[model samples]
Target: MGNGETSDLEPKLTVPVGATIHVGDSFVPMAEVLAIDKEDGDLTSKIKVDGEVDTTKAGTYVLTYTVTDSKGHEVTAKQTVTVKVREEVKNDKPILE
Candidate 1:
């Protein structure tokens, strides 16, 4: 996704035990290393992310990716990716009216 593009579902990150984490930028076209859990070694990436971080582990993690525009301004965008403990439903279920 490009800058200023709001995603219906934001991107996610899931890795195995001792896996390399990587995040790439769209507007700026660069990669970011995020900082994960330190105590349990979950937050094992860099904190150079430009947008927000949703630590909602039980469900889905929406990572709103961001980047600085050519004018040196911060831009917000997103891509939908899943990082899960195991494969499950990608989308949330709806209730009947």
Candidate 2:
């Protein structure tokens, strides 16, 4: 969420934050960037994220988004994405009833 703020001096991240995914699911986290006064403000396509996520295992992963503006200034942002295991319900019918 942004307040419609714009300043051509520096690049800012429009993407809110990190996310969560299930262990057995596919997860590809995307980072969105905003540069001032541009019609297409998202520069996520220009940058590459540095991290890896093993969806096969349940754990926390740290991903970093790094980008360099036209002015040769670099900006880096990091987010923690978590993978959780699915909860299973126990069938305890006619145990003590």
Candidate 3:
């Protein structure tokens, strides 16, 4: 589990069009691109992401994505993924130190 429960029904990761993501160094999987809905005639694109990640080690990872439209058109994208793992620390506080 990721620190605590996600506690949300919506996808945890959501990005706007032309926005780049940075995932430092975590064992995160590629985000599945759902749809590029523009039926409202707006020039904005909403990307839907759904995936599970496991970060046993601290490092950096990137998500290289490729999307193919119905017209046989493909788009490539890259996002940075960062994973930070702090060592478990005891709650003991030393007043003498």
Candidate 4:
């Protein structure tokens, strides 16, 4: 007996164009950017990702998301993360010169 059958299924996960995060803030891209599908597993359990975001820095970081479906189809996707400098809202100013 021989076991040699390639996968014929197409597995895909939702990926957004970009995500936003304030400086020194935290953001979970896997839960925020990975969309759901009827045939796919949960967002937390299905996908594997790469790259780490620096909350202290403000710039665009690219990340890779890879997943393998039950049918043996492997898919990988990329997303851009935007780290901004948006600050908290304060109605009053501390001091003026």
RMSD values, in order shown = 16.2, 10.4, 17.0, 7.0
Candidate 4 residue-wise lDDT, 51-71, digit = tens: 888788778898888877665
> Candidate 3, which segments miss by more than 4 Å at Cα?
1-34, 37-54, 88-97
Cα lDDT tens digits, model 2, 5-53, are: 4455555545435778887887656523332314435556656578887
Candidate 2 residue 1 C-alpha distance from true site, Å: 41
Model 1 Cα lDDT, one tens digit per residue, 17-82: 222122321222124333233223323232234333232343233345433322233334444433
lDDT tens readout by residue for model 3, 1-97? 3565433222222333332232334232334333352222211233323333336644455554444443333445555545555665454678785
C-alpha TM-scores of all predictions = 0.25, 0.63, 0.39, 0.64
Q: What is the lDDT of residue 85 in candidate 4?
A: 76
lDDT of 1: 0.33
Q: Which candidate wins on lDDT?
A: 4
- What residue pairs are clashing in model 2? none
Clash number for every model?
9, 0, 12, 0
Please rank every candidate by lDDT, starting with the best.
Answer: 4, 2, 3, 1
lDDT of 3 at 34: 38
